[model samples]
Target: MSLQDAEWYWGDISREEVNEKLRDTADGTFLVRDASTKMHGDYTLTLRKGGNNKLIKIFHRDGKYGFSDPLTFSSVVELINHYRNESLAQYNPKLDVKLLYPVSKYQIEAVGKKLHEYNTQFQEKSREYDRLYEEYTRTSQEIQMKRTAIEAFNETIKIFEEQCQTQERYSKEYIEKFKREGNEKEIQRIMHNYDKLKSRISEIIDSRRRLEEDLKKQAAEYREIDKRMNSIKPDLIQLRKTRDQYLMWLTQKGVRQKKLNE
Candidate 1:
């Protein structure tokens, strides 16, 4: 994927002769060194079956081995010449050291731009992660407090029940006598008080349920953001590290090449 595809055209060499030479050579291949990129060392060329998904054909190594985007060649000379002339020519000549190397201002600026972009994205993602963490903390505390309130309400309701029992025992005889006489006021008053107690208990239960649902919803949203941040952190870190390494390689290799040239 990192490597670009080569443009194919007719050249002054025959495919049959090139193929025979390649077959006779050791490993059926040879090295293709990009003098401009000597740090990576020599790369090899090979003939392999490709395309059509049915009929057999030969293709050149357009990309690094195990990498994507392969290209085909009409002849070996065409493949080699294309890289040596086109690709090499386009590389920064200012950085060339006959025996010694120098860094290119252009490549330094290019990688600097990439690092800038990477840093911006990484910062934004990290901020989002921090925001989600704060939300999780706040939601967790709310859940804990609501749980405590629900338990306290339950205890209070138990006390109300005990008080009602004590009151009922004190009025037992009057209530029984009144019931025998069909006196509605005494029975109505007791029923009214019991209804008030039940209504208060119901209100507490509803509040508890609502709080629980809110906590669950909040927790789910927090987890979603949390997971997203966690997954992207590694990707961002690796991207930055790779970019840094590339910049470092360019800097060090250029100085070494320059010293050798001198």
Candidate 2:
């Protein structure tokens, strides 16, 4: 979900609360002005969503319009999450923003490969869940129809019992021929019909058993997928962090050199 969309489920937060959390450190640590909130108005951040999830930016704050060193898209996500949930650990303040944001081609490829596996697994399971639900609906309808047929057969039996002991032989013949036809064929027919009805009732039982077992299996599969997905997330985060640390270290070393020269 988008940063703004996450708030759709949670209660709305005010601008004051937002401001307090995002402090501008270049001036005073507590000053919120020119600090970026979810909307990157004051801070220079280039975020492209609905396509590639990346933030490529050049900071132009404090009369400087130079580019920011690139950070992973996930790092940007961490910053936003920190803002929304104060319970989260704060974003680590790298001394050099440019080095912190710089991209590493090899590491980015590795992260993408890992994340794709989880993404695929998740989508496939959801599709299977949908298929199972549809089958449940169809099987339920079949069960209903068979149950109704059995009920009607029962009512017919009750009416036949009422007329069982009639005094008129002719009338009895009429009932025997037209109504139930007390012959062996008729008896076999009724028995067979009832047996068929019974079997269909058993199907409902079997259908539920089978579907539920499949559902449980699918659930287990999804949980495995979830476990795998979680495993990848941290790997993705940490590698990019290491990459950023590399850049930040490089940039800070340059600053230290400048100080020595002065």
Candidate 3:
């Protein structure tokens, strides 16, 4: 690619501008800009190293561009490409930096936009996961409560059955005694109490049955929530994996600039 096609080519920015761009970047991050002094060279390569921005004059001699005469290139892009793989320590022992990364505004903007979108999506999914978990917890508690209620009702129903049976046996004995004594009134009173006890037992059984139905419904609802949570588990995991991958790809050195060269 020519210098124009290279994303790292900041055409005519000032030294301050180049410094501002490179100041916060990683060591070895570099960019090229039109040199302010035309007599010195056509472009200036600014890079970050040792927590400072360093400048190198790129000279054009005999239609070839480079830092030095014998190791020149046909284009500024080629010169940069060479220095990316080779270190600047060859030219000057004091300059031990490599052009490992290219400061491309366009690349940074594009990647930043994507990262923001991913972050938003990740946050949304995380909220969804939290909501689902809350629902799952509530549903589990509700299901347990229903089961406990049903168990308690079952015990109450068993007690009511025993009571009803005892009442029935007493009424039978009272009827036999009243018949032997020729007392119809006593027999009638005994039968009335027995009927009342049986009705109460039936009411309790009906209540227990209703509670059983509730338990079944709650159990079904719990299962549905569990299924939904299970399905979203993978989606959440995949989103996290993709977000991390993009972050790593952006932060890693030389990857973007290498792609540009290719």
Candidate 4:
């Protein structure tokens, strides 16, 4: 039962009263209570004690009562704890309901642990996907900007080439004028203009290369993130299946228990 309801099941109850309630419980699936709780509706179950310090049988219930396999306990505490464990899990949302089963408590704890792990992994994976998607958007925008810059650089390169061509034509005209006047400055002017264009082209090429490298790296990173995000979805599906299987098993077991009581 809930922690808030647990108080009704323990404390300040006499041992004789506890034994009397345990012994007085009727057969064929009826409601029993621990020493502390009132022998009333709701927080009660079916238990039959037999032999010294040994239990004969017990049954469980949901919103409706049911019956199940016989069980034994070393003491009243053990029997009550068994019922309480199951009741706590079933009534409350935090603990695993399978903890009430007759199997190894270790197994019950393990399944609960695995479910928690799956939930945590799913949550983290979802968060990571969101983060990666945001990063991808930013990177995509950056790549577009880089492409635009590259286009602008190419346009500038074309302009410089045209300037160089126009200057070269001027040098040709000046050389022709020099041939008539015997001046040497025309060759220097032509070389200076050619060198300036060469330097500008080199800078643009270097910038474009760096930008392309960054784009390639960002694209690869985005692909890896997308794949990981897709993979997590399948993992989540599988984990949920595992959890649902356990839940379905519990459901079938409950039906069987009810039929047995019937």
- Specify the highest-lDDT model's number: 3
Best by TM-score: 3
Better of 1 and 3 by lDDT: 3
Q: TM-scores of the models, in the given order?
A: 0.46, 0.30, 0.54, 0.46
Off by over 4 Å in 2: 1-184, 251-262
* Candidate 2 lDDT tens digits, 14-108: 44543333333221111122333444433333222222222323343443332343332343334443333431122324221221221111324
Per-residue alpha-carbon lDDT of candidate 4 for residues 1-262, written as tens digits (9 for 90 to 100):
4423432243334545445444644222122343234443223333333211122223333323322333343333345555545543343343223223221111244444554566566567667667867876877787678778878877887887788788777678777878678666766676786888779778877887887787788778768777876777677666666655554444543544323322
- In angstroms, the error of model 4 at 38 is 37
Cand. 2 TM to true fold: 0.30
- Name the runs in model 3 displaced over 4 angstroms: 1-107, 252-262
lDDT of 1 by residue, 1-262 (tens): 1122332211222444345334433321223222222333223332222211111122334432311134444444454554434422232243221111111122254555555566566667667667767876786777678678767767876786677677678767777888999998988897788777667767766776786777678667767766776887787677666655655555664544333322
RMSD (CA, Å), each prediction: 16.0, 17.3, 15.2, 18.9
Give the clashing residue pairs of candidate 2, or none. Answer: 69-98, 69-101, 69-102, 70-101, 70-102, 71-101
lDDT of each: 0.50, 0.41, 0.80, 0.52
Error of 2 at 119 (Å): 21
Per-residue lDDT tens digits for candidate 3, residues 73-116, read: 88888888888898899788888877888888553657655766
- Ranking by lDDT, best first? 3, 4, 1, 2
